[PDB]
Amino acid sequence: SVLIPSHAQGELTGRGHKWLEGDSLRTHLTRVEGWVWKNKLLALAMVTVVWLTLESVVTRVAVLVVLLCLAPVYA
Amino acid sequence: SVLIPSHAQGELTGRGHKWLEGDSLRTHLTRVEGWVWKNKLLALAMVTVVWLTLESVVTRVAVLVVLLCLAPVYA
Amino acid sequence: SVLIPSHAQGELTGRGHKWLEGDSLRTHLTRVEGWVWKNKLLALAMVTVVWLTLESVVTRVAVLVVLLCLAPVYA
Amino acid sequence: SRCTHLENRDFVTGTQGTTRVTLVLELGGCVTITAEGKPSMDVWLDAIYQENPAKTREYCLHAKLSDTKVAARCPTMGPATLTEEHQGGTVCKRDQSDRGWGNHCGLFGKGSIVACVKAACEAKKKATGHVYDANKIVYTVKVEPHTGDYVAANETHSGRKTASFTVSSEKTILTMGEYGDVSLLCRVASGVDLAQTVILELDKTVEHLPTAWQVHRDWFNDLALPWKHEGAQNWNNAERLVEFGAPHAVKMDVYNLGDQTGVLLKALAGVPVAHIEGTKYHLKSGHVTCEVGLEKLKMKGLTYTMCDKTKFTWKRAPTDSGHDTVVMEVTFSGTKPCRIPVRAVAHGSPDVNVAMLITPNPTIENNGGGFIEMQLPPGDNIIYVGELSHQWFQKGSSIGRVFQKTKKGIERLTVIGEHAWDFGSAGGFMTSIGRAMHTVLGGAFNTLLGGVGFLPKILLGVAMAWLGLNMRNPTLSMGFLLSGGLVLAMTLGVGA
Amino acid sequence: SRCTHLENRDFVTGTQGTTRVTLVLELGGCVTITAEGKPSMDVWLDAIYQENPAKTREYCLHAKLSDTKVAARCPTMGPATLTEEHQGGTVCKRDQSDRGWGNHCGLFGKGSIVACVKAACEAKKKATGHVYDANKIVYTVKVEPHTGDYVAANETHSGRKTASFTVSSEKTILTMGEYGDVSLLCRVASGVDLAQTVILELDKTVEHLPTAWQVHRDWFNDLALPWKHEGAQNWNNAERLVEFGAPHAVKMDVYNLGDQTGVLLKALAGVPVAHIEGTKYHLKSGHVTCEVGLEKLKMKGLTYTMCDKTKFTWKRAPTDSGHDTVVMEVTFSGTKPCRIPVRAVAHGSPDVNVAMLITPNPTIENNGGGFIEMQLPPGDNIIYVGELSHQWFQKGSSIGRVFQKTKKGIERLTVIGEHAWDFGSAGGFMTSIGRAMHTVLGGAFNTLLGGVGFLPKILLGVAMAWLGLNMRNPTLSMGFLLSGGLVLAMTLGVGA
Amino acid sequence: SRCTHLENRDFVTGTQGTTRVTLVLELGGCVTITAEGKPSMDVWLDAIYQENPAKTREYCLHAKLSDTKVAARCPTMGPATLTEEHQGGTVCKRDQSDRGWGNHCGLFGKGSIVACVKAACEAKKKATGHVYDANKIVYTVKVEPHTGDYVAANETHSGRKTASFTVSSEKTILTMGEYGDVSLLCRVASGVDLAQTVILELDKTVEHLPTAWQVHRDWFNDLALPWKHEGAQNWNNAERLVEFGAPHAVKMDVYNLGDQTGVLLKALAGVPVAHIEGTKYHLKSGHVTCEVGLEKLKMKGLTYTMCDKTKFTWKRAPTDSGHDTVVMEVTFSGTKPCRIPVRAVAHGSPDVNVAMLITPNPTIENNGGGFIEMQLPPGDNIIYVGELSHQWFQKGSSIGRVFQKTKKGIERLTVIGEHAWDFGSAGGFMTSIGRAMHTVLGGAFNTLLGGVGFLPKILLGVAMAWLGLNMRNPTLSMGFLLSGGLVLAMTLGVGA
């Protein structure tokens, strides 16, 4: 029934404590670096379908930098 | 000073116990992954300079399979 | 298992007693020559195949030294 | 059956009229042999040993030093000399110190100094090699019938009989009780190569190490330690554990290269472990090729009545043995000596008993019985013992069976090598080419690469393949591609 | 003069206007100051020590094990656990045993086993690190005036003076009787780098090993051994001296990997030795930049009478010192306090004196005097002391002496590095260009290749130079070839 | 007739020679069997349960924390250490606090601090998982005859018979009173996969939650909470509910993440309910396959006389069952027992009876009877019971009937999987193709994509269709379009 979304890093008392300190950037980079070692074979499918279908190194890199950062949002 | 070689992995036979079980394939492949995760800047430099200086995926992989595995005598 | 890697040979001030003289050419040359005296058939096969197959004296000499210095090293 | 206890079980069977089967028996292995209308039989190798084998070299792991002396001479007074340079069991170095009026010489320049020390092993710090003699080795084989009873790993079974084989005794006949007679032929050829194999003993007394190791002879001859043969009082090459300090005027320092500067840990990693037991020196990984004759075996109890069907109860309800077979045990009450009316069925048609019994003609006797082992087809079955019945569901598939048997096959081949072809209830002509190819190719690979490490064998295989791609001649190119791929495959093929 | 005892000596020359000199004094080195119109001085660094430095880690080299225990549970009966699994001082392994009806079980499958053993260090088998405090270190500098009196390396000189330097001490003066005073400053914050170096102690009671070793901090902090800090009862790293045998059904054996002392000693091969003396911990390699001032000095006896030329007799005749100098000792029977008429001449040209004395204004005194040292040109000479004469042949050449000072410069620049530019009686503008270019180009090599091994540095440098022979542009070819030359040149001196 | 009480009811049919029917029986489902000339039966699965299933893990939802302690050390004074680090039931963390003159330290820098706290579960705040043993599961199947009397839900019918199936059973036989014997066989293996289900329990005393949940085993072993197995006094992973504050100089806060009950109850959304009753642990989900044999069933009352056509009156007038059948009840005043003259006609001819009765040969008994159920064709009809006449407009159409019977087949296929092909009284060739295609294609989808989330599955299916449109090869294009469509159809066929 009840749902409560956690709010963004808008309010920032600069030099007091931060409770659990769920700071999103370093947390999500750590999540991505864990995911690519646990699910290590799945990145081969992602790089190969992009490398085969897209017609430049620039557009291949552009989609992979996004997609491999999005990937741990799903299972 | 003494030098005392590691025993060759070709005398082994039978279903009985192999002492410390230093089985070199699973041992050294695990060691190599742990080392290239620490030596990360060198690993990125080696894969990119080879990709920029050899003509096909076959010859690029053939030198990288050696060059990324000099670490039991290099550092 | 325990491992205690060798201390760096430079990096420290001289003009006092060192515990032993470092590996230098001495340990390298005696370890490589002592391997060629044992694996004679493979050493002869390697030098003859490399010398017959590769397209220049400089690439032959480079590969011969590389294959010899990388052979006895493993533990 | 002792064959149910071990994980590394095997099964082989004689066809209609097959009187003889050839086995390879291994330490830590066990074989059930079955043939039409003969009692199912278990065979295994229990020990390979000798008593008090011959000592080869002794090596020293920790040198005691004592009674050091030094002598030195002023510049141009000639070389310094000691009596101790001529004795046995002394290590010495001759070297030059800088000298002058500050250290009571008449001239500034280089003198000469000689320093000495005695060497001996610390009280229990030796390493001893021992070697087997083919004329005195004992191989021990044991045989057990399927009695239809059950016993633990720590229970004495009346049906076990044993025969000891050595070069003077190849053949024996064993009386298996009412099950008749079995004939074993062993040989001391096949099995462990006693020319390459050394048993290494350090100290038997220690609480937390194995008592010995199975070391290779070409490695053991090359240990860069001090060494001797038995009974000798003084050590060859004792300079391997002493180093001498830089010379300082009239004094010089002697140092150990430390205790346990020798064989334990990383040097022996992967070497098979051995065992010592009073006078006996056992190997603990090894095999023998052995032939079993099934002519003189007898079924028990084909004259008995079948049980009264209502009078059973389960003692151990059906369970999966792990070998792709079902095991169960029944209690009964009534007239004692009887046949058990065992069968099992699938949902397709009711008359077809599908159970292959591995205990043939099961019975209850006056003292015990009523254990059964059976093999069933994949899928859903009902198992029966009179009016007891119990549903069952066999795992896997007719394809999955073949993959399991194929891996057990390769796992025999990679561990035993050329002798793996001797395992079978047949010996037909195609076995001769199979054994001949491994005699050639295994000998070739072992001759060139037998002492080479796993990683450099892979680098060599990669180099052979890559040279094969770069060669301009097509015959040399193809030969290098074939031989490089083979070198990789038979380097990597240590398991499945 | 102490400078004659040691194999290593240097000369710094103070021409008129040199009121102060900058030295890099070293353990295992010794310097003479010779100054225009002032006595010659010996100067050297005699010790670097602390009383009771702070302990860092203790490691253990040899495990003692006791009270091993094991517990196991049948398949599906849940994981095994035991009381010692959560205590201190204990090593544990959790693993899966194959189980089935033969091992007293209800089912065939993987069960659970846990094994435990207590751990301790054997009584003398520790390795202890100690670390220096820059506020409590003591550097000792000594000076000895050229009294013209000669003493052995094993006896006292009455004129030898000691200065002990700490962070808590400024420019300090040593009185020297009639020679005046010498005024001396030691920069304790600019000697050894106490942040990066550790003193390693095993057992001091061992008769045939040095008492301590000097090691780098980022080697000592990441050894793979059991470790602890002082006064704690239990060992505090995941255990590397203990190993667990492959599990049986109800039992699992525990192994001890033995004494590591030898693999430690073999890994320390190449490090400097240190020393321990009751409570003082001494470095045996090290240096300090130190500044020595001369305006307060005097020549003794410049008013004294000349000697009777006829009354001299030799006590030790001329011989070569090994430092390109002639040394001698005379004796006299006249009224003692007087100035010795020393001179020396080229053979066949009696007019020109060629004695460059290292002892300015020699004298006889009521209780001593008569030692002389001089440098003479190559070839034939006559040495005089009054009416005594002796004929001397001086080995060498002007080219040989320039080569000797060239070699000695490269040796100090190799041993001491950047600070070697600060040695001398001068500080002219070129020395700033030298120290700057050394700091930048040597700092690049240290940054890029610090900690890389000697063999792989050579292989990398040779390969990079060889690739330099065929690069895509001559600008890249030349730049890489020059950098490969630099990498090898730094490696082949001391960059190992 | 219990099948009239339930929203799900399937009808099965057959000729005189059929003898046997194969059914899949489901919790909350029901079946009526209508074989030619046999008395009709209602059949259903009433319960799947075990008494006292074995506990797997226990998890803690609300940590209780107590007796916290903290210890700290000055910079360079080594690590802080405390007794509570080496006990069961404590959680600890160590960190580097800032220190200086202002908190009684000699140096400015980073110290060391450790904080310890005891951990437990609050009194009723556990989750317990339970798992079934296939040797002890009871399935209860019930059978009811169409006796022509109406007994409501929530009251007791005398004609119901019960059979309890466990792994030790074959064909049972139930005496259905005067209607003869029904023979019934249950396959206790397959359908529900008992290795993959955990019955989760929180607290049975809470008034406003289900007593248990049917959770999946791969999910239940990945719960990131503190855990143990039964009878142990200490919790593994207790650091999952403690969180530690940032360090101060000589203090560090311990925080509790609180009662997790609400997060678990939200995560369980979409998991079927289960029920606990004293010792019994029921599923309320799943199915079994049965074969039911009709051969020994007897028609009651074939020998009786007809009723007087004039003496009937209605008790329940003809009413729609909701299952495409008409339900009615009559009362009678003549002599008993006797047969009810029931028939129905279309307006197009009064001679042709079109009543397809579900109640065969309906009767009045001395103390019961008088209820009839029947199926009528579409359109306008008259129902006769002697002189009683009632009009009836039958809803729906022949094409509508084909649709509803097709649609309920798709519900079996999505809710039951491959077992949907086994529901039927006779064989037919396309059923052999259907099971093969379903087990192959559903096996491929469940192998490749099984556990993937619903939105990710749709996104991958849409991406596969996009690759099908954009990639240039026509064979790969068509293969991607076909396979993307199949992936989307099977995904949308299970939903979220």
Numbering used by the authors:
A (entry chain F), B (entry chain E), C (entry chain D): 1 to 75
D (entry chain B), E (entry chain A), F (entry chain C): 1 to 496
The study reports:
The E protein is a class II fusion protein and the largest of the structural proteins. It is the main protein responsible for receptor binding and fusion, as well as the major target for neutralizing antibodies. The prM protein is a precursor that is cleaved by the host cell protease furin into mature M protein and a pr peptide.
We designed a chimeric virus based on the infectious clone of LGTV, replacing the prM protein and the ecto-E protein with those of TBEV strain 93/783 (24). We determined the structures of LGTV and chimeric LGTVT:prME using cryogenic electron microscopy (cryo-EM) and three-dimensional image reconstruction. The electron micrographs of virus preparations contained mainly intact spherical virions with a size of ~50 nm in diameter, along with some broken particles. We generated a 3.22 Å resolution map of LGTVT:prME and a 3.82 Å resolution map of LGTV. The new models included two extra residues in the C-terminus of the E protein (residues 495 and 496), and the LGTVT:prME model has one more residue in the C-terminus of the M protein (residue 75). Both structures are consistent with those of TBEV, with the root mean square deviation (RMSD) of Cα atoms across protein chains below 0.7 Å for the E proteins and below 1.5 Å for the M proteins. The ordered lipid head groups are also present in similar positions; hence, there are no major structural rearrangements in the chimeric virus compared to the TBEV Kuutsalo-14 isolate. Mass spectrometry analysis of LGTVT:prME confirmed the presence of N-linked glycosylation at position Asn154 of the E-protein. The TBEV strain 93/783 that was used to generate the chimeric virus has an unusual amino acid substitution on the surface of the E protein (Ala83Thr), which is a putative site for O-linked glycosylation; however, we did not detect O-linked glycosylation of TBEV prM or E ectodomains in viruses produced in A549 Mavs-/- cells or in primary murine neurons. Furthermore, no corresponding densities were observed in the structural reconstructions.
